[PDB]
Design an enzyme around this catalytic site. Structure first.
Site, PDB file in Angstrom:
ATOM      1  N   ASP A  22      80.759 -65.115  -5.041  1.00  0.00           N
ATOM      2  CA  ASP A  22      79.773 -64.513  -4.635  1.00  0.00           C
ATOM      3  C   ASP A  22      78.619 -64.796  -5.546  1.00  0.00           C
ATOM      4  O   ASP A  22      78.638 -65.663  -6.494  1.00  0.00           O
ATOM      5  CB  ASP A  22      80.278 -62.873  -4.553  1.00  0.00           C
ATOM      6  CG  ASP A  22      80.317 -62.560  -5.891  1.00  0.00           C
ATOM      7  OD1 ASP A  22      79.937 -62.978  -7.247  1.00  0.00           O
ATOM      8  OD2 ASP A  22      80.557 -60.933  -6.187  1.00  0.00           O
ATOM      9  N   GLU A  29      75.781 -59.588   4.071  1.00  0.00           N
ATOM     10  CA  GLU A  29      76.897 -60.263   3.220  1.00  0.00           C
ATOM     11  C   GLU A  29      77.544 -61.490   3.667  1.00  0.00           C
ATOM     12  O   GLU A  29      78.051 -62.406   2.862  1.00  0.00           O
ATOM     13  CB  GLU A  29      78.012 -59.284   3.321  1.00  0.00           C
ATOM     14  CG  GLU A  29      77.942 -58.111   2.592  1.00  0.00           C
ATOM     15  CD  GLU A  29      77.816 -58.025   0.977  1.00  0.00           C
ATOM     16  OE1 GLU A  29      78.042 -59.287   0.791  1.00  0.00           O
ATOM     17  OE2 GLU A  29      77.364 -57.341   0.257  1.00  0.00           O
TER      18      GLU A  29
END
Ligand SMILES: [Cl-]
Ligand SMILES: [Cl-]
Length: 162
Positions: A20, A11
């Site tokens: 994202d 991540e």
């Protein structure tokens, strides 16, 4: 290697609101703030998450707190889901981390849709599971990450993260 380090690798860590892979406002270590296209909305949800007026930025500590909450929540979500629990309990330690990773990324529901792969994992049919899971939007959208998690399920080792 543990769940924290594994997710921290997949991540990253960003201290300012960012979008994202799907274009959604996120912050920290993969903490989704909102699916809404509104940045204000994202700012709103962030302040509410942190408990202060952040103005789109947080500290490392604060990112790590969100991460602890998120991992805890993911695991708890697994144990409460009738389709996931049995799988999770059947696995060894390393493979359990692979399952947590997927839930952290995609949500329980999303994971719970991998019926066939889940059954295969429950049967300890590693390769078959790996090949089935790759036939997914997940794999085609974030293939490097998906390859790492798949390898983890396949081998029960951390080789993919070394
Ligand atoms: Cl496909
Ligand atoms: Cl990826």
């Amino acid at each position: 290697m543990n769940i924290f380090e594994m997710l921290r690798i997949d991540e990253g860590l960003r201290l300012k609101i960012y979008k994202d892979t799907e274009g959604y406002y996120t912050i920290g270590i993969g903490h989704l703030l909102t699916k809404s296209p509104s940045l204000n909305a994202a700012k709103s949800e962030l302040d509410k998450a942190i408990g202060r007026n952040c103005n789109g930025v947080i500290t490392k500590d604060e990112a790590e707190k969100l991460f602890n909450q998120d991992v805890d929540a993911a695991v708890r979500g697994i144990l409460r889901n009738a389709k996931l629990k049995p799988v999770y309990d059947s696995l060894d330690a390393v493979r359990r981390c692979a399952l947590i990773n997927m839930v952290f990324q995609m949500g329980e529901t999303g994971v719970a849709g991998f019926t066939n792969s889940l059954r295969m994992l429950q049967q300890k049919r590693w390769d078959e599971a790996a090949v089935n899971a790759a036939k997914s939007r997940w794999y085609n959208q974030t293939p490097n990450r998906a390859k790492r998690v798949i390898t983890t399920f396949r081998t029960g080792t951390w080789d993919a993260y070394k």
